[PDB]
């Protein structure tokens, strides 16, 4: 397999729970770039209004698909490496 041009361009196949979350916001495919996964996760958070309205770096997700994926009731968007760790557990890397 070729090394991706950037981390954002890594090709991935979401595992079933994460794929269900993506499809809930309109995703149609089984394979995505990491950047695409991050955009659909942002769209899920905004359309379901999960961010704290006053402190918008905090996300509340207790028991929704997202909280079940990440295994937490809330998280801070500022915890970049923690969020990536949680996302990666829910992906398989694929060729190209």
């Amino acid at each position: 397999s070729q090394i991706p041009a950037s981390e954002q361009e890594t090709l991935v196949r979401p595992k079933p729970l994460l794929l269900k979350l993506l499809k809930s916001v309109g995703a149609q495919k089984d394979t995505y770039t990491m950047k695409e996964v991050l955009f659909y996760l942002g769209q899920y958070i905004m359309t379901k209004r999960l961010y704290d309205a006053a402190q918008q770096h905090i996300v509340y997700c207790s028991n929704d698909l997202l909280g079940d994926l990440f295994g937490v009731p809330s998280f801070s968007v500022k915890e970049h490496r923690k969020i990536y760790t949680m996302i990666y557990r829910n992906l398989v890397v694929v060729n190209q």
Binding site: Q8, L41, G42, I45, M46, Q56, H57, V77, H80, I83
Partner: peptide, 11 residues
């Protein structure tokens, strides 16, 4: 800062 802008700083 908007959630949109915080999340833009991940990718």
């Amino acid at each position: 800062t908007s959630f949109x802008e915080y999340w833009x700083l991940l990718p």
